[PDB]
Every structure is written in C-alpha cells, then in structure tokens.
Amino acid sequence: ATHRLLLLGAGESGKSTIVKQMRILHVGEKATKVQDIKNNLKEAIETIVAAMSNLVPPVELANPENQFRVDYILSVMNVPDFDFPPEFYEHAKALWEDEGVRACYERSNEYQLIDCAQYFLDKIDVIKQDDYVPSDQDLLRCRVLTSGIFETKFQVDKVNFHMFDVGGQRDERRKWIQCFNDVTAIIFVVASSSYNMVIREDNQTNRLQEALNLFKSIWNNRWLRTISVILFLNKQDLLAEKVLAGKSKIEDYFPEFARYTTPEDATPEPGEDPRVTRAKYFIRDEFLRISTASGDGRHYCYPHFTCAVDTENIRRVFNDCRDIIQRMHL
Amino acid sequence: YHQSYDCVCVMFASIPDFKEFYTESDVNKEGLECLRLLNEIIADFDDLLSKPKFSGVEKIKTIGSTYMAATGLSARQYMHIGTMVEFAYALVGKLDAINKHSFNDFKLRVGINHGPVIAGVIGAQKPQYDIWGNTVNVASRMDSTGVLDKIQVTEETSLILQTLGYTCTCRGIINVKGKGDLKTYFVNT
Amino acid sequence: MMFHKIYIQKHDNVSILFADIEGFTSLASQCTAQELVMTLNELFARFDKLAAENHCLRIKILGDCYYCVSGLPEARADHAHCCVEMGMDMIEAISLVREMTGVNVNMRVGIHSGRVHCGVLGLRKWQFDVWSNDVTLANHMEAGGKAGRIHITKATLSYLNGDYEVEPGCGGERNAYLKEHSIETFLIL
Numbered sequence: 001a002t003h004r005l006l007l008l009g010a011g012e013s014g015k016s017t018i019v020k021q022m023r024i025l026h027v028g029e030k031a032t033k034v035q036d037i038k039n040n041l042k043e044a045i046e047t048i049v050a051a052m053s054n055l056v057p058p059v060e061l062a063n064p065e066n067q068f069r070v071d072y073i074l075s076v077m078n079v080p081d082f083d084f085p086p087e088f089y090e091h092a093k094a095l096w097e098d099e100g101v102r103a104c105y106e107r108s109n110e111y112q113l114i115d116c117a118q119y120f121l122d123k124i125d126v127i128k129q130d131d132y133v134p135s136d137q138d139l140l141r142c143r144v145l146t147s148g149i150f151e152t153k154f155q156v157d158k159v160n161f162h163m164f165d166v167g168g169q170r171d172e173r174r175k176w177i178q179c180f181n182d183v184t185a186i187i188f189v190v191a192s193s194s195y196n197m198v199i200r201e202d203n204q205t206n207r208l209q210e211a212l213n214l215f216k217s218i219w220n221n222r223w224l225r226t227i228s229v230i231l232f233l234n235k236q237d238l239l240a241e242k243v244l245a246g247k248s249k250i251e252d253y254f255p256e257f258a259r260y261t262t263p264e265d266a267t268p269e270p271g272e273d274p275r276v277t278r279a280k281y282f283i284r285d286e287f288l289r290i291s292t293a294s295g296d297g298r299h300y301c302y303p304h305f306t307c308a309v310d311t312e313n314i315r316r317v318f319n320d321c322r323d324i325i326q327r328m329h330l
Numbered sequence: 331y332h333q334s335y336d337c338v339c340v341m342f343a344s345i346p347d348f349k350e351f352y353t354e355s356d357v358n359k360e361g362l363e364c365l366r367l368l369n370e371i372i373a374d375f376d377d378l379l380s381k382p383k384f385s386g387v388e389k390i391k392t393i394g395s396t397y398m399a400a401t402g403l404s405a406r407q408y409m410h411i412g413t414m415v416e417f418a419y420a421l422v423g424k425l426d427a428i429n430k431h432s433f434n435d436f437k438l439r440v441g442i443n444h445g446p447v448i449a450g451v452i453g454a455q456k457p458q459y460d461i462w463g464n465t466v467n468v469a470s471r472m473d474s475t476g477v478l479d480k481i482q483v484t485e486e487t488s489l490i491l492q493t494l495g496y497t498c499t500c501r502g503i504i505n506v507k508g509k510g511d512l513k514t515y516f517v518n519t
Numbered sequence: 520m521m522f523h524k525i526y527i528q529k530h531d532n533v534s535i536l537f538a539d540i541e542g543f544t545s546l547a548s549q550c551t552a553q554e555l556v557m558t559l560n561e562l563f564a565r566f567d568k569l570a571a572e573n574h575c576l577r578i579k580i581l582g583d584c585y586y587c588v589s590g591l592p593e594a595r596a597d598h599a600h601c602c603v604e605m606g607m608d609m610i611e612a613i614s615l616v617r618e619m620t621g622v623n624v625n626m627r628v629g630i631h632s633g634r635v636h637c638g639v640l641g642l643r644k645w646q647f648d649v650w651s652n653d654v655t656l657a658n659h660m661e662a663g664g665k666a667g668r669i670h671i672t673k674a675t676l677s678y679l680n681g682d683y684e685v686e687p688g689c690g691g692e693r694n695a696y697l698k699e700h701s702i703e704t705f706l707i708l
C-alpha cells in the first residue's frame with residue numbers, strides 16, 4: 001500500500017522542515033550544510049543591522065564602538081564568495097550583544113528576517129570552530145529556499161509513502177498542478193506565528209491572510225474536490241512566545257479576534273496558558289471556517305497543532321496522520 | 331470534394347507561454363502532467379462551441395497549444411466576423427478561469443482575418459476537414475506577430491469590424507514574411 | 520475523477536520526421552486558391568501513400584507542414600530507417616509534382632529519434648498527434664534544414680546502424696535552437 005502526500009503552503013511555512021523530520025524519523029552529508037548554516041548566520045546579522053537606520057523611528061546603537069563593526073558588516077554584505085575569517089564571527093557576536101541591535105531584532109516583524117536568526121546567533125562560538133559538526137536541530141533550523149518539486153520516499157511499518165515538497169512563493173505555485181492528479185492527501189502547512197508579518201513577495205500582504213487565501217484556493221480548487229486536507233498549524237512555539245510577550249496583539253491584525261472565545265471541546269496541553277490556548281484555536285477556526293462552507297462530504301479537513309523543528313511533536317502528529325489515511329481508506 | 335467560399339472568418343488563438351511551462355522530469359512523468367493541463371484548457375475552449383451564441387463557430391483543429399477556428403462555413407452579411415471576435419473574448423474568460431485554479435498567468439494572443447478559402451479533405455489517409463488559402467495564411471501571421479492580450483486584425487477586417495460598431499487602433503506597418511508591408515490594427519476591448 | 524480522462528500514451532525508441540514548404544505564404548499569394556489546393560493535394564496524397572509503404576504513421580498536415588512517425592503504434596526496431604526511407608521517397612515525389620504542375624515547390628526535411636507522448640487532446644474534433652521535447656527538436660531540425668535534403672540528428676544517426684552516408688549538418692549555424700541545445704546535425708547524401 002503506497003500513499004502520495006503533497007506539501008502545500010506559502011513560503012517559509014515549514015514544508016521542507018517537515019520533509020527533513022521524515023528522514024530523521026523514517027530513513028556524511030552534514031559537511032555540506034555547514035556552508036548553508038554560515039550563510040543563514042551572515043544573512044541574519046546583516047539584515048538586522050541594515051534595518052536599524054531604515055525603521056521609523058530608527059534604532060540607535062547602545063555602544064558607539066559597534067558603529068565600526070556595522071560599517072564592517074555592510075561592506076561585506078554583497079561579497080560573493082565570503083571566506084568567513086575569524087574576524088567576522090567576532091564582529092557579528094559583538095553586535096549581537098549590543099542592546100540596540102537587540103531592540104531592532106525585536107521589531108523584526110517590520111522587515112524581512114529569516115526564522116533561524118536567534119537560533120544561530122546564540123551559538124556563533126559553536127559554528128566558528130573549524131571542527132564544527134552540525135547537530136540534528138541545526139540542520140532542521142537551516143533555511144534554504146525551495147524552487148522546483150522534490151520527491152522523498154520512506155517506509156513506515158511496511159507501508160510506502162511518496163512525499164512531494166514544493167516551493168511556497170508566488171512564482172513557484174505554478175508548479176503544484178503537476179502533482180494534483182492521483183494525490184492520496186494534501187498536507188497544508190501554515191506559519192501560525194506570522195500574524196504580525198507581511199509576505200516577502202510584495203511587502204504588503206499579511207502573511208496569515210496570504211495563508212488563508214491560499215487555503216481557500218486549494219480547498220475550493222476544481223481538481224481537488226475529493227481530496228482531503230491535513231492542516232498543519234505549524235510554528236506553535238513561536239506563536240506562544242509571541243502571545244505571552246504581549247508586544248504584538250493578534251486583534252491589531254485580525255479584529256475578529258476580539259469576539260472569539262475558546263471552544264468547549266478544546267484540549268489544551270498540560271500547563272498551557274489560556275491565552276495561548278485561545279490564540280492557537282482562533283487561528284485553527286479561521287481555517288476551519290473555510291473548510292466548513294463547501295465540500296459536502298466529498299472530502300474533509302484534519303487540523304493538527306505543529307512545531308516542525310521538534311522531532312518529538314512530528315513523530316506524534318505524523319502517527320496521527322498515518323491513522324487518518326488508513327481508517328478512511330485513502 | 332472541395333468547396334469554395336467568399337467570406338469566411340479565420341482565427342488563430344495562441345498561448346505563447348505554454349512552451350516554457352512545459353518541462354520533462356520524473357516528477358511530472360516526462361511531461362505528461364503538463365499535457366494534462368493542456369487537455370483541460372482545450373476542453374474548456376471546446377465547451378464554448380455548445381453555447382447557442384457560438385453555433386456558427388467551427389473548430390478546425392488545434393496546432394500544438396494554438397486554437398484554430400472559423401465562422402461563415404454554413405453559408406449584416408458580415409455579422410459572422412463580429413461573432414469570431416466574440417468567441418476570442420470568451421476563450422480569454424476560460425483561460426482566466428484555468429489560471430485561477432492552476433496558479434499560473436497564461437495569456438492568449440489572437441489573430442483574425444477574413445476572405446475566400448477552400449474547404450474539404452486532403453490527402454489519402456483520414457477524413458479531416460480543413461480550410462486553405464492566403465486568407466488562412468495571413469490570419470496566422472496576425473497571431474505570430476501579435477501581442478499578448480490583444481486581437482490583431484488586418485485592414486479590411488478592421489473596416490468590417492468598424493461598420494459593426496468596433497473600435498480599432500492602428501498597430502502600424504509590419505513586414506509580414508511572404509507578404510511584405512501590411513498595415514494592421516488592434517481591436518479595442 | 521476531477522480531471523478529464525486523458526487519452527494519451529508514452530512511447531520510447533521512435534522516430535519523427537517533419538517536412539515543410541519553403542516560401543508557402545509567398546506562393547499562396549500568387550496562384551488562385553484552387554491551384555494551391557490542387558497542387559497541395561497532389562503532393563500530400565502521394566506522401567500519404569508513401570507513408571504506408573514505409574511503415575510510417577502520418578500524423579497531421581498543418582497547411583504546408585507534413586509530419587509522421589515510425590515505431591507507432593506497435594514497436595519496430597527498424598524505426599530510424601523508415602523515416603530515412605520516407606524522406607527519400609518524399610523528396611523524389613516533390614520533384615515530380617514540381618515538373619507536371621510548374622509550381623515552385625521545395626521542402627526541407629528533418630528527423631530526430633527519442634521518446635514521445637501521443638494520442639488526442641480536448642473533447643471536440645479529435646486528431647492523433649505527438650508531444651515531447653524530442654518532437655520539438657525534430658520540428659526545429661526541419662527549420663534548420665536545407666531545401667530538398669534530409670537533415671538528421673546524431674541521436675537518429677545512432678539508430679541508423681551506419682547504412683547511410685552523411686556529411687556535417689552545421690544546423691547550429693542555421694538554427695538558434697540547435698545551437699543553444701548543443702545539437703550535432705548531419706545531412707544524408
């Protein structure tokens with residue numbers, strides 16, 4: 001018995017991460033990913049530093065000494081083959097310790113910053129080493145844009161799976177069609193914590209709103225009328241962290257949130273703050289509210305709260321997916 | 331048997347961007363998945379022929395991803411020409427619908443001409459109806475030298491369209507392979 | 520099923536031949552629609568007969584463009600030879616029709632071998648056809664050919680088993696597609 005799962009969702013939602021977790025779960029190369037991890041690191045610091053003078057109001061450095069390091073970073077920003085001299089890591093680390101740089105980082109939702117920014121900058125001392133070996137979590141956090149369609153195959157209890165990973169950005173979506181025919185089920189990934197952010201494509205469209213429009217496009221599509229959708233409400237960790245912080249209020253981006261109460265049948269995790277419960281379920285309902293409008297039994301929607309960078313959470317939710325495929329005879 | 335006609339309107343509707351969309355990989359089954367979409371596109375165009383307002387439209391064939399059709403084969407002596415332009419608008423609606431569900435942005439490029447043609451079957455293999463002539467050649471040139479989202483017509487075709495209440499904008503004089511300098515117009519939508 | 524049933528099947532190890540008239544638009548601008556059709560029917564009827572004699576399956580006729588494939592429907596290891604022999608007879612037939620008609624007819628011939636997808640598209644007016652990068656290449660080989668000669672690719676030459684004498688094609692310098700794709704062409708003597 002073989003199943004063909006397709007991964008859809010907007011860019012940076014976590015699709016490629018889900019595929020990686022499949023290898024760590026159901027399936028020498030770490031030496032090539034190092035270069036990518038360093039690029040993420042470089043890209044992270046330069047983006048924060050470049051945004052400082054462009055924000056309204058601008059963010060000032062806490063240490064005038066670091067102004068020279070800022071000048072340093074900006075000069076090498078477009079260097080094709082960067083050789084990463086030990087100097088770079090020193091300057092980068094010093095900037096990351098500057099309070100000004102931190103305050104700018106806090107307002108990262110006001111510009112385009114990769115998700116692994118904080119993860120890598122906190123371990124510069126680890127990556128700088130010439131004998132550095134990437135951990136599992138490092139490879140999971142490493143971000144590299146997907147362009148084209150990739151196929152991954154794995155077995156789970158003698159059951160075959162063919163997982164297709166595609167690009168989530170606008171220009172790439174034109175390729176999805178090539179995987180619509182005879183798809184066992186679709187896995188729609190959503191970056192739940194991206195409610196206070198806008199897409200890269202135009203710098204205006206709200207990231208969560210884009211997710212919603214895209215889901216409505218897939219759920220109501222003419223060639224997917226009988227195809228069920230497994231909805232991964234990804235980035236649960238960043239969602240909770242944001243909700244608790246209290247700086248960005250969900251109701252400032254999605255007004256309707258002010259009239260939302262937690263459903264009775266809600267199953268919160270042990271020790272989970274009510275505010276987090278209320279937020280994660282609100283987001284789930286915005287998506288369910290679309291899946292409810294049409295379909296009429298010829299296909300359903302199966303929600304799941306998810307954190308792709310957690311092999312623990314993924315093993316659990318994917319097992320739940322395994323059950324859905326088999327008991328529904330898909 | 332071949333039959334002559336004096337006033338038949340021919341149309342060639344292309345999708346210039348399809349060739350680029352088409353690729354062969356192990357994921358798309360050596361281009362089969364791409365052809366699956368072309369089949370959906372042609373099918374939606376073919377379904378317009380059943381609309382009562384298009385009963386006078388004859389689909390001749392499909393060259394690759396180009397759609398070839400004609401009106402006036404079942405013969406305001408000129409209304410059939412205006413109808414051909416109405417059919418070209420409807421294809422755009424159908425292609426826009428496909429784009430919506432396939433996350434693409436395919437655009438149609440039309441060319442229309444009118445005049446005498448010869449209709450019938452040719453060769454010795456299969457009974458395939460077709461139309462020939464300089465009129466059919468020029469219609470096709472109006473497509474290949476056309477612009478995306480535009481309908482390019484010839485001078486006399488433009489005059490007929492105007493009598494029917496159509497606005498046309500001069501594209502200028504272009505050197506058409508085999509014909510030389512021809513003045514052509516763009517229909518105003 | 521939400522996708523229309525597709526009537527398409529894949530086929531490996533086949534050959535594709537294209538043939539096209541040189542300056543057909545210029546020719547159709549000189550003689551009556553009747554003459555053009557009589558001349559064109561005199562030519563293609565013979566081709567169609569020559570097709571069956573050479574185990575070639577005629578696909579379709581696009582005005583002045585004539586094309587067929589070998590290895591279809593049923594497989595045949597003699598494929599490359601069939602198209603080569605088909606071109607041979609074709610070029611000769613063109614010369615006879617040129618003599619008794621008086622019309623200046625000349626055609627370029629092109630051949631390539633590889634895989635294709637074949638069948639039909641849409642709902643109305645079905646017509647057997649072929650699609651694939653290899654088919655696209657064969658089409659360009661014709662465009663990059665020479666008046667009254669058979670232009671073949673290296674891929675096709677490897678199926679010929681050395682039964683025909685060829686010479687450097689230099690198609691790269693006659694057609695942009697052939698160059699950008701690093702194609703090595705030849706010309707059968």
Ligand SMILES: Nc1nc2c(ncn2[C@@H]2O[C@H](COP(=O)(O)OP(=O)(O)OP(O)(O)=S)[C@@H](O)[C@H]2O)c(=O)[nH]1
Nearest residue numbers: 011012013014015016017141143146168235307308
């Ligand atoms: N903290 C956190 N980071 C996550 C989570 N899921 C994914 N990420 C990170 O977000 C980034 C983007 O994820 P990725 O998988 O690359 O997106 P994508 O959907 O494949 O993106 P694309 O190819 O359409 S452009 C990666 O750095 C990844 O590690 C999550 O649940 N929590």
Ligand SMILES: C=C[C@@]1(C)CC(=O)[C@]2(O)[C@@]3(C)[C@@H](O)CCC(C)(C)[C@@H]3[C@H](O)[C@H](OC(C)=O)[C@@]2(C)O1
Nearest residue numbers: 349352393394395396649650651652654655658
């Ligand atoms: C459908 C896609 C693709 C790529 C497939 C293909 O091989 C073609 O259909 C051929 C070559 C092929 O079908 C043979 C006939 C003809 C008429 C020569 C085609 C056109 O040139 C198509 O392009 C156009 C412009 O319609 C092309 C190239 O399109």
Ligand SMILES: Nc1ncnc2c1ncn2[C@@H]1CC[C@H](COP(=O)(O)OP(=O)(O)OP(=O)(O)O)O1
Nearest residue numbers: 461466467470508540541542543544545581582
């Ligand atoms: N019934 C038809 N079906 C499809 N295409 C047609 C039909 N009638 C004519 N055509 C087309 C439009 C013009 C084209 C013939 O001209 P073509 O573009 O081959 O050039 P040409 O013959 O003038 O010059 P050349 O072949 O030397 O470049 O074939």
Ligand SMILES: [Cl-]
Nearest residue numbers: 010013191211
């Ligand atoms: Cl998203």
Ligand SMILES: [Mg+2]
Nearest residue numbers: 015016145146
């Ligand atoms: Mg990706």
Ligand SMILES: [Mg+2]
Nearest residue numbers: 539540583584
């Ligand atoms: Mg031609």
Ligand SMILES: [Mn+2]
Nearest residue numbers: 539540541543
């Ligand atoms: Mn020609």
